[PDB]
Design an enzyme around this catalytic site. Structure first.
Site, PDB file in Angstrom:
ATOM      1  N   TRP A  83      -9.318   6.336  -0.353  1.00 36.98           N
ATOM      2  CA  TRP A  83      -9.674   7.066  -1.559  1.00 36.98           C
ATOM      3  C   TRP A  83      -8.725   6.608  -2.664  1.00 36.98           C
ATOM      4  O   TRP A  83      -7.708   5.965  -2.400  1.00 36.98           O
ATOM      5  CB  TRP A  83      -9.601   8.578  -1.355  1.00 36.98           C
ATOM      6  CG  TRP A  83      -8.290   9.071  -0.816  1.00 36.98           C
ATOM      7  CD1 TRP A  83      -7.130   9.293  -1.526  1.00 36.98           C
ATOM      8  CD2 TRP A  83      -8.003   9.430   0.540  1.00 36.98           C
ATOM      9  NE1 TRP A  83      -6.147   9.762  -0.685  1.00 36.98           N
ATOM     10  CE2 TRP A  83      -6.652   9.846   0.589  1.00 36.98           C
ATOM     11  CE3 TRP A  83      -8.752   9.432   1.721  1.00 36.98           C
ATOM     12  CZ2 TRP A  83      -6.039  10.264   1.769  1.00 36.98           C
ATOM     13  CZ3 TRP A  83      -8.143   9.853   2.902  1.00 36.98           C
ATOM     14  CH2 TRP A  83      -6.801  10.269   2.916  1.00 36.98           C
TER      15      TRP A  83
ATOM     16  N   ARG B  10       0.130   4.585   2.843  1.00 37.56           N
ATOM     17  CA  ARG B  10       0.227   4.360   4.284  1.00 37.56           C
ATOM     18  C   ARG B  10       0.657   5.579   5.097  1.00 37.56           C
ATOM     19  O   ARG B  10       0.692   5.473   6.331  1.00 37.56           O
ATOM     20  CB  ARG B  10       1.184   3.209   4.570  1.00 37.56           C
ATOM     21  CG  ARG B  10       0.551   1.841   4.374  1.00 37.56           C
ATOM     22  CD  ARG B  10       1.588   0.760   4.618  1.00 37.56           C
ATOM     23  NE  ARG B  10       2.504   0.616   3.480  1.00 37.56           N
ATOM     24  CZ  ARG B  10       3.675  -0.010   3.547  1.00 37.56           C
ATOM     25  NH1 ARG B  10       4.085  -0.519   4.701  1.00 37.56           N
ATOM     26  NH2 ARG B  10       4.439  -0.135   2.460  1.00 37.56           N
TER      27      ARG B  10
ATOM     28  N   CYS C  67       0.840  -1.195   0.000  1.00 38.76           N
ATOM     29  CA  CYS C  67       0.000   0.000   0.000  1.00 38.76           C
ATOM     30  C   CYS C  67       0.875   1.244   0.000  1.00 38.76           C
ATOM     31  O   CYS C  67       1.621   1.485   0.956  1.00 38.76           O
ATOM     32  CB  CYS C  67      -0.938   0.027   1.212  1.00 38.76           C
ATOM     33  SG  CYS C  67      -1.948   1.539   1.282  1.00 38.76           S
TER      34      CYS C  67
HETATM   35  C1  HEM Z   1      -6.309   6.441   2.107  1.00 35.55           C
HETATM   36  C2  HEM Z   1      -5.953   6.356   0.822  1.00 35.55           C
HETATM   37  C3  HEM Z   1      -5.315   5.082   0.211  1.00 35.55           C
HETATM   38  C4  HEM Z   1      -4.671   5.076  -0.953  1.00 35.55           C
HETATM   39  C5  HEM Z   1      -4.428   6.299  -1.875  1.00 35.55           C
HETATM   40  C6  HEM Z   1      -4.228   3.732  -1.205  1.00 35.55           C
HETATM   41  C7  HEM Z   1      -3.511   3.322  -2.310  1.00 35.55           C
HETATM   42  C8  HEM Z   1      -3.305   2.001  -2.595  1.00 35.55           C
HETATM   43  C9  HEM Z   1      -3.004   1.459  -3.896  1.00 35.55           C
HETATM   44  C10 HEM Z   1      -2.848   2.304  -5.175  1.00 35.55           C
HETATM   45  C11 HEM Z   1      -2.870   0.134  -3.766  1.00 35.55           C
HETATM   46  C12 HEM Z   1      -2.553  -0.828  -4.924  1.00 35.55           C
HETATM   47  C13 HEM Z   1      -3.922  -1.207  -5.485  1.00 35.55           C
HETATM   48  C14 HEM Z   1      -3.878  -1.789  -6.875  1.00 35.55           C
HETATM   49  O1  HEM Z   1      -2.840  -1.675  -7.544  1.00 35.55           O
HETATM   50  O2  HEM Z   1      -4.900  -2.346  -7.344  1.00 35.55           O
HETATM   51  C15 HEM Z   1      -3.101  -0.216  -2.372  1.00 35.55           C
HETATM   52  C16 HEM Z   1      -3.063  -1.474  -1.798  1.00 35.55           C
HETATM   53  C17 HEM Z   1      -3.485  -1.814  -0.515  1.00 35.55           C
HETATM   54  N1  HEM Z   1      -4.035  -0.976   0.445  1.00 35.55           N
HETATM   55 FE1  HEM Z   1      -3.992   1.010   0.305  1.00 35.55          FE
HETATM   56  N2  HEM Z   1      -4.619   2.927  -0.146  1.00 35.55           N
HETATM   57  C18 HEM Z   1      -5.309   3.730   0.755  1.00 35.55           C
HETATM   58  C19 HEM Z   1      -5.900   3.321   1.941  1.00 35.55           C
HETATM   59  C20 HEM Z   1      -5.871   2.084   2.550  1.00 35.55           C
HETATM   60  C21 HEM Z   1      -6.545   1.678   3.784  1.00 35.55           C
HETATM   61  C22 HEM Z   1      -7.437   2.612   4.635  1.00 35.55           C
HETATM   62  C23 HEM Z   1      -6.260   0.387   4.007  1.00 35.55           C
HETATM   63  C24 HEM Z   1      -6.674  -0.545   5.175  1.00 35.55           C
HETATM   64  C25 HEM Z   1      -7.155  -0.100   6.353  1.00 35.55           C
HETATM   65  C26 HEM Z   1      -5.399  -0.050   2.923  1.00 35.55           C
HETATM   66  C27 HEM Z   1      -4.867  -1.303   2.756  1.00 35.55           C
HETATM   67  C28 HEM Z   1      -4.308  -1.740   1.573  1.00 35.55           C
HETATM   68  C29 HEM Z   1      -3.891  -3.096   1.310  1.00 35.55           C
HETATM   69  C30 HEM Z   1      -4.020  -4.294   2.285  1.00 35.55           C
HETATM   70  C31 HEM Z   1      -3.412  -3.142   0.069  1.00 35.55           C
HETATM   71  C32 HEM Z   1      -2.842  -4.407  -0.612  1.00 35.55           C
HETATM   72  C33 HEM Z   1      -3.950  -5.208  -1.266  1.00 35.55           C
HETATM   73  C34 HEM Z   1      -3.410  -6.559  -1.668  1.00 35.55           C
HETATM   74  O3  HEM Z   1      -2.355  -7.011  -1.136  1.00 35.55           O
HETATM   75  O4  HEM Z   1      -4.058  -7.195  -2.529  1.00 35.55           O
HETATM   76  N3  HEM Z   1      -5.191   0.997   2.061  1.00 35.55           N
HETATM   77  N4  HEM Z   1      -3.374   0.962  -1.687  1.00 35.55           N
HETATM   78  C1  LIG Z   2      -7.987   0.653   0.672  1.00 34.97           C
HETATM   79  C2  LIG Z   2      -7.606   0.836  -0.770  1.00 34.97           C
HETATM   80  C3  LIG Z   2      -7.584   2.103  -1.335  1.00 34.97           C
HETATM   81  C4  LIG Z   2      -7.243   2.216  -2.678  1.00 34.97           C
HETATM   82  N1  LIG Z   2      -7.192   3.442  -3.264  1.00 34.97           N
HETATM   83  N2  LIG Z   2      -6.960   1.101  -3.396  1.00 34.97           N
HETATM   84  C5  LIG Z   2      -6.971  -0.143  -2.863  1.00 34.97           C
HETATM   85  C6  LIG Z   2      -6.672  -1.283  -3.628  1.00 34.97           C
HETATM   86  C7  LIG Z   2      -6.677  -2.561  -3.055  1.00 34.97           C
HETATM   87  C8  LIG Z   2      -6.402  -3.828  -3.820  1.00 34.97           C
HETATM   88  C9  LIG Z   2      -5.861  -3.844  -5.096  1.00 34.97           C
HETATM   89  C10 LIG Z   2      -5.649  -5.042  -5.779  1.00 34.97           C
HETATM   90  C11 LIG Z   2      -6.001  -6.265  -5.216  1.00 34.97           C
HETATM   91  O1  LIG Z   2      -5.797  -7.468  -5.870  1.00 34.97           O
HETATM   92  C12 LIG Z   2      -6.130  -7.685  -7.247  1.00 34.97           C
HETATM   93  C13 LIG Z   2      -6.359  -9.163  -7.543  1.00 34.97           C
HETATM   94  C14 LIG Z   2      -5.907 -10.147  -6.663  1.00 34.97           C
HETATM   95  C15 LIG Z   2      -6.134 -11.491  -6.952  1.00 34.97           C
HETATM   96  C16 LIG Z   2      -6.812 -11.831  -8.116  1.00 34.97           C
HETATM   97  C17 LIG Z   2      -7.248 -10.821  -8.967  1.00 34.97           C
HETATM   98  N3  LIG Z   2      -7.020  -9.532  -8.672  1.00 34.97           N
HETATM   99  C18 LIG Z   2      -6.558  -6.260  -3.949  1.00 34.97           C
HETATM  100  C19 LIG Z   2      -6.954  -7.580  -3.316  1.00 34.97           C
HETATM  101  N4  LIG Z   2      -8.354  -7.550  -2.859  1.00 34.97           N
HETATM  102  C20 LIG Z   2      -6.768  -5.057  -3.271  1.00 34.97           C
HETATM  103  C21 LIG Z   2      -7.011  -2.665  -1.711  1.00 34.97           C
HETATM  104  C22 LIG Z   2      -7.329  -1.543  -0.953  1.00 34.97           C
HETATM  105  C23 LIG Z   2      -7.299  -0.281  -1.529  1.00 34.97           C
END
Ligand code: HEM
Ligand SMILES: Cc1cc(N)nc2cc(-c3ccc(OCc4ccccn4)c(CN)c3)ccc12
Ligand code: HEM
Ligand SMILES: Cc1cc(N)nc2cc(-c3ccc(OCc4ccccn4)c(CN)c3)ccc12
Ligand SMILES: C[C@H](O)[C@H](O)[C@H]1CNc2nc(N)[nH]c(=O)c2N1
Ligand SMILES: C[C@H](O)[C@H](O)[C@H]1CNc2nc(N)[nH]c(=O)c2N1
Ligand SMILES: [Zn+2]
Lengths: 416, 411
Positions: B281, B112, B109
């Site tokens: 967001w 953070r 993420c």
């Molecule tokens: C507040 C603004 C936030 C922004 C701008 C943001 C941005 C991002 C982005 C761009 C990704 C990659 C997503 C993708 O490529 O599809 C990501 C992943 C992630 N975010 Fe954040 N995020 C935010 C908030 C949060 C919050 C509030 C949480 C949890 C309480 C969180 C937990 C995660 C997790 C766990 C991932 C990894 C998902 C995975 O491993 O599949 N994020 N975030």
């Molecule tokens: C809190 C928040 C804010 C934000 N702006 N973006 C966020 C993006 C993710 C996020 C992105 C890609 C992901 O995995 C794609 C996938 C996996 C496996 C198979 C197919 N595709 C997952 C897994 N659920 C989560 C999570 C949280 C976000």
């Protein structure tokens, strides 16, 4: 270690199965609890002992005879015995020309960071192990440059100088590439030319080079033979093919006075074959456009031209959310590809190259049981996810023969 | 041992000690790196107490009261409870601490820098899917906040025996349906074709449009899931237009303002929270690059490049790259003009670098997954591309779990 590992492509659903990882021979830097996959690099007296050299040579000789479908043959067992005697009597051994060529091609095939490996078997190998002097090295390098340039129809090539013996007689090219532009730090803190090459430029100047102090000055070769102090040589300018950068639409792009050289020829890596160490082994291919248009030109610590291009494009540069940087970056890479293609100098765009690499990877999985690949390096530095390699899972591991990093020679050289 | 990471643009070197605290595996070994694998592959009282003790210890270490009387009493309290119930319940303070730290520890993420500003909604008293729907509506309303989005997480009851799991079946709370057409192609969002078909098969009447908000499909206490329509006045959406291309609005594109991931598992102190929707967001590229331009998503590059009258016969014209930048300009312009929170990838990655600096100074490191942190366009003209990162697993954490329709035994 598990015997079959699966990698998936999340865009096509294709799943491939890797068994070649079982043959990995060196460390990645990762552990069970930490991944160092984004770390760029995870004694000179010390050379391989007899006991260290025996298993490394047998491993390579076995691999070579397996590749020519003669494993276990009389020629295989005799080559093993001849190598073992050499190591016994002299603490080292000499590769046959066939083995040298096989080893070089496979170090490229094994280079996990190279997106261009679909070409790995079309490598012209120049055997320079009879070289004794820096003048001789200069001759070999000029011939390499001329052959590989081929008037713009570039051909991949490597020139291999003598292997390390005791570590006090190394051959080295002090340049990081055969052709690069000088960089000059000014008293006021600004830089003229390529900021990447300031340190090397200063070394050349101390060695006697008279610098023209321009923006695109080809650096001299700084060449070390047999452990001697290095010597300077000017590459004949007619051997240095260059491309002036212009834009198909923007007539003002030529007025920026940018150009680049045609031949990317990395010269500071070490080639390891069968436990032997070739510390001087310059190799060259052709460019992917982004290497020039994104990194060389738009890195902040390089030529850093985004600003000026955006101005001439009359973009709003006050807020980042206008994406003025991204918009100028595309136009610059459009110009680089257009200028090379117009002058008939081989170049490949990042879409074509990554699409070829996927086809290559799939074939290697089918015929070889895997293809080590470093995603952090394979994915291009712009437009990542609209290339197919972004969505492709990869396994990274180190096979030998290999190209390795080595310390910069001015940090280790003992001055005569 | 101490590990160093270097920024090759600024030459700043940070020193990681925090990795020494991890005990979960990455998937890599000394011989093979799996850094680009997406998923590199029901407790007991004996598994559960060391995990609980570790988490209690780090919580009381975090509030500067390690080995205090309350710390000692909490440890004994948790001891008796695992003994006599096979589990334990977190205090409210520990729930909040654990949820913020799961975000703080999310190596993938880039957002953070905000981790300690997270609104935590305790839903551990929920028993039915109607109760889940109420809690989720309140989450959506609070987090949306009329465009001034606020990060939030809603935490439903923890796993007990694995047969009574709470699950949100949606992958996000707000997503658009996808429809497999007669002529083979796809209408809507192809990422959700399967989930959409499950909603239709469960009784949902599909409008069969391009941007149909999916219903919620909610499973409480292991029962069959139930459908619910989110009240539309709660679903904030942004029509996409371009600041210079007045033809862009004629593409008919839109997107929703609230990204709320609902299919992950929250692990705190050995307890598993299988339903924990969390939202923040958007970073613009999540919509403008991945959602709109992935081959297996909305796939609008050709259409946009057509209306830009770009030469599309040769890849080396970079027509795809030109259209990609213009789409992402439109997304950022549309959200900003409607005063809906969004961050561009330059500002977000810049904030992440500053966040890394903070964490190394006050915490001794920051686990970070370069493969995910670097944005899907313009990689090397963002500062994270040039930043070495170390990836490692700290707990509390967000984890992947199987899709419920592969597990759930119906009735
Ligand atoms: C507040 C603004 C936030 C922004 C701008 C943001 C941005 C991002 C982005 C761009 C990704 C990659 C997503 C993708 O490529 O599809 C990501 C992943 C992630 N975010 Fe954040 N995020 C935010 C908030 C949060 C919050 C509030 C949480 C949890 C309480 C969180 C937990 C995660 C997790 C766990 C991932 C990894 C998902 C995975 O491993 O599949 N994020 N975030
Ligand atoms: C809190 C928040 C804010 C934000 N702006 N973006 C966020 C993006 C993710 C996020 C992105 C890609 C992901 O995995 C794609 C996938 C996996 C496996 C198979 C197919 N595709 C997952 C897994 N659920 C989560 C999570 C949280 C976000
Ligand atoms: C023929 C066309 C070739 C293309 C298009 C190509 C492409 C690339 C690119 C784009 C990179 C990343 C470079 C960077 O980001 O600066 C790279 C790295 C590399 N290439 Fe290739 N290459 C080619 C030929 C070769 C040849 C002939 C060899 C060796 C015989 C080779 C060996 C390597 C190695 C070892 C690396 C990694 C360099 C490092 O880790 O520092 N390549 N290549
Ligand atoms: C044969 C060929 C064709 C082609 N088109 N591109 C090529 C690029 C490389 C290449 C790239 C990056 C490198 O390292 C950057 C660095 C390291 C450490 C610190 C700073 N920067 C090195 C180091 N020798 C080589 C090598 C061969 C190529
Ligand atoms: C920190 C990071 O590893 C570093 O910037 C890498 C990232 N990926 C790269 N990829 C390529 N092809 N070339 C590079 O120089 C780099 N640099
Ligand atoms: C194969 C690869 O791991 C996969 O495509 C990853 C790469 N990096 C990513 N990075 C982000 N931010 N989001 C993603 O979905 C992905 N996908
Ligand atoms: Zn790794």
């Amino acid at each position: 270690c598990p015997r079959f590992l699966k990698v998936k492509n999340w865009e096509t659903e294709v799943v491939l199965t890797d068994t070649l990882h079982l043959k990995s021979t060196l460390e990645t830097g990762c552990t069970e609890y930490i991944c160092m996959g984004s770390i760029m690099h995870p004694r000179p007296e010390d050379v391989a002992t007899k006991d260290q050299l025996f298993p490394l040579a047998k491993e390579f000789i076995d691999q070579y005879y397996s590749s020519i479908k003669r494993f276990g043959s009389k020629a295989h067992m005799e080559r093993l015995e001849e190598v073992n005697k050499e190591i016994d009597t002299t603490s080292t051994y000499q590769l046959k020309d066939t083995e040298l060529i096989y080893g070089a091609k496979h170090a490229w095939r094994n280079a996990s960071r190279c997106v261009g490996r679909i070409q790995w078997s079309k490598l012209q190998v120049f055997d320079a192990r009879d070289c004794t002097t820096a003048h001789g090295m200069f001759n070999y390098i000029c011939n390499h440059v001329k052959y590989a340039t081929n008037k713009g129809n570039l051909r991949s090539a490597i020139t291999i100088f003598p292997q390390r013996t005791d570590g006090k007689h190394d051959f080295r090219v002090w340049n990081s590439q055969l052709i690069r532009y000088a960089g000059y730090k000014q008293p006021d803190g600004s830089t003229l030319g390529d900021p990447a090459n300031v340190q090397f430029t200063e070394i050349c100047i101390q060695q006697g080079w008279k610098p023209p102090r321009g923006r695109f000055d080809v650096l001299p070769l700084l060449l070390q033979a047999n452990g001697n102090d290095p010597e300077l040589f000017q590459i004949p300018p007619e051997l240095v093919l260059e491309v002036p950068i212009r834009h198909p639409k923007f007539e003002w792009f030529k007025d920026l006075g940018l150009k680049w050289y045609g031949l990317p020829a990395v010269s500071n890596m070490l080639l390891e074959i069968g436990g032997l160490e070739f510390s001087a082994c310059p190799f060259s291919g052709w460019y992917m456009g982004t290497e020039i248009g994104v990194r060389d030109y738009c890195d902040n610590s390089r030529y850093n031209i985004l600003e000026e291009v955006a101005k001439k494009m009359n973009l709003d540069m006050r807020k980042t959310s206008s994406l003025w940087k991204d918009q100028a970056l595309v136009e610059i890479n459009i110009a680089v590809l257009y200028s090379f293609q117009s002058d008939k100098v081989t170049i490949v765009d990042h879409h074509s190259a990554t699409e070829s690499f996927i086809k290559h990877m799939e074939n290697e999985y089918r015929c070889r049981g895997g293809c080590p690949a470093d995603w952090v390096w394979i994915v291009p530095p712009m437009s990542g996810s609209i290339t197919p390699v972004f969505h492709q899972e990869m396994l990274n591991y180190r096979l030998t023969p290999s190209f390795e990093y080595q310390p910069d020679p001015w940090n280790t050289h003992v001055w005569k």
